[PDB]
Paper text:
Mtb protein Rv2498c is currently annotated as the β-subunit (CitE) of the heterotrimeric prokaryotic citrate lyase complex involved in TCA cycle cataplerosis. Combining phylogenetic analysis, in vitro enzymatic assays, in vivo Mtb experiments, and X-ray crystallography, we identified Mtb Rv2498c as an essential stereospecific bifunctional β-hydroxyacyl-CoA lyase (β-HAC lyase) that carries out the last step of itaconate dissimilation pathway and confers resistance to itaconate. To investigate the molecular basis of Rv2498c substrate stereospecificity for the carbon–carbon bond, we determined the structures of Rv2498c in a variety of liganded states by X-ray crystallography.
Rv2498c catalyzed the carbon–carbon bond cleavage of (S)-citramalyl-CoA to form pyruvate and Ac-CoA (kcat/Km = 2.3 × 105).
Numbering used by the authors:
A (entry chain A), B (entry chain A), C (entry chain A): 2 to 224, 250 to 265
The structure:
């Protein structure tokens, strides 16, 4: 029941088992990371820590490696010796990549052009329980050099994919996860970004540092003709 | 021939037959509303006023209730005793929801994530003559709390759906209707918004108060290499 | 090998063979234009100049007329007496319009609502090697009057199509070409626009005047948690 946890999710590299307990205490949900947070040479060690140092599987997701990679095959073998049931799929690009992870629950991380183009098909796949987007791999794989303008605001193609993922998730009753704020010390920018995300109906802001969790939890709390939806807005604020 | 009427369309709750004549005098097209403008307990009375107090069916659309609801079934029964041929479908989410309203003409009001994801299929359905988007139900159904930033500008997912509906409508030769400006006294904001909508090729700005109609009509009137399209822009301004 | 040429592409009307040599010297790739750059009465003469005054076919694309037009049929006849292998298809609106140009390579120019709605299908068609978008025909065909706000920034539906084309191109490994800056003397605006385009991974900025080429080439050269994609950003900047 991931929708019952709060909006602050925290990545934690899985080759750092000494930090698992602190990550769990700081965040609503921990994403133990076998992908880009762990160096290729450290991924075997991270798979052992995954088995050796368990966290609450009701509050923990495992980010595996991308479809078709040898690393993902090793990840799923390691996961068999765990109680984790929900995985995050990076570079998610087709419904078939989600379906081959059945019977696990899948959070699809769309961070390439093909995943954006196919977001609705990815969201609709039966194992999907959530959609995330990743600004940095998105820009990297498009061939660009930055996800943000000088003032920290997302560039337009990033805004486009962000909206795409929010709509695709909501169309199929999935959780919607907003992209990470890489500038850890930029609390002001994270504050505005998470408030923006909460305002349009994102369920989660994913973080890469535990200091970001209090900012996210606070942002997801609120500070002319009135129709029925505007009353729903007011009710959403109270909840 | 709704494309021949001006750009100022006005919602009027159908349980207010005393206001029908004033709505018709104020607006280019009246949308008699059986959905969110009328309280659930008042919808039977509104269906009687629909039959009892007719407006010009060439300049009047009836907003019915959403597909699958008992209310929509009662609405279509009431409409059989009228000369209205065009209905507005709220929470429009599939081509099938449009097709089941044949042989009526349908303006699909997309105001949910699923309708945005399926906008092209909805626009392409044979009964469709127009696409509208609804910012407030959109944000409400996504789980968010406001469609606009502090300065009154739409949030990004709203801008995304607005463009989606304009493109889907135009791709299939349909009318494009822009969302309502709920802040009635915010004439400055409506002025900018309707000018923006007219500039990109929206056909209609829908209003919720008759004072908004003169602002919309005025906004839809106009105040380096030149290629063939730039001359079309100039010709569009003159027309 | 169009990806090996630089980012500065230049339209040159094909009824101006006296300017072909200067266009080739100024630009990375020349788009010899049989469509909107040439008046209808001048198109036969332009087809003769196409045969009579050749440019390097490895650095030259021919913009033909739109699918289904008598002009496109005459264009393809003229092209048979040339060594050009790559054409640009204006008002590109379906995969079928691309496929009927086989065995030529095709740069699809999306500049209508239907082409935006079908961009992924157009990009995926086997002859496609590139996607471009055209702001001015886009707004013209939507029924609007300007692609840009007062400050020169694109209106939202233009930003939407721009992102659509970048994502559709990148999803299928195609070149991504950004729209032309019609205000030739607005060097500052072109500078910002091409920098923006290069930053998100556009491959080409198309120009309509040779003075714009140096601005584009310079713009496509570059002036907190670090993950693998941010290192790819840094590597992209160095390249
Ligand atoms: Mg990533
Ligand atoms: Mg509504
Ligand atoms: Mg054009």
């Amino acid at each position: 029941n991931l929708r019952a946890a709060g909006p602050g999710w925290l990545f934690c590299p899985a080759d750092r088992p000494e930090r698992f307990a602190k990550a769990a205490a700081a965040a609503d949900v921990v994403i133990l990371d076998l992908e880009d947070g762990v160096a290729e040479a450290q991924k075997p060690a991270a798979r052992n820590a995954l088995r050796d140092t368990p966290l609450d599987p009701e509050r923990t997701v495992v980010r595996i490696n991308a479809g078709g990679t040898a690393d993902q095959a090793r990840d799923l073998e390691a996961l068999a010796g765990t109680a984790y049931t929900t995985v995050m799929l990076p570079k998610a690009e087709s419904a078939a990549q989600v379906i081959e992870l059945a019977p696990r629950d899948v959070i699809a991380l769309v961070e390439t052009a093909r995943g954006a183009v196919c977001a609705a098909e990815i969201a609709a796949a039966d194992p999907t329980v959530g959609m995330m987007w990743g600004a940095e791999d998105l820009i990297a794989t498009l061939g660009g050099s930055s996800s943000r303008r000088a003032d920290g605001a997302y560039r337009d193609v990033a805004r486009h994919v962000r909206s795409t993922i929010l709509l695709a998730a909501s169309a199929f009753g999935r959780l919607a996860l907003d992209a990470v704020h890489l500038d850890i010390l930029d609390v002001e920018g994270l504050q505005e970004e998470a408030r923006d995300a909460a305002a349009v109906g994102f369920d989660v802001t994913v973080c890469i540092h535990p200091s970001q969790i209090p900012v996210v939890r606070k942002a997801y709390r609120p500070s002319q003709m009135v129709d029925s939806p505007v009353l729903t807005h007011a009710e959403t604020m109270l909840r």
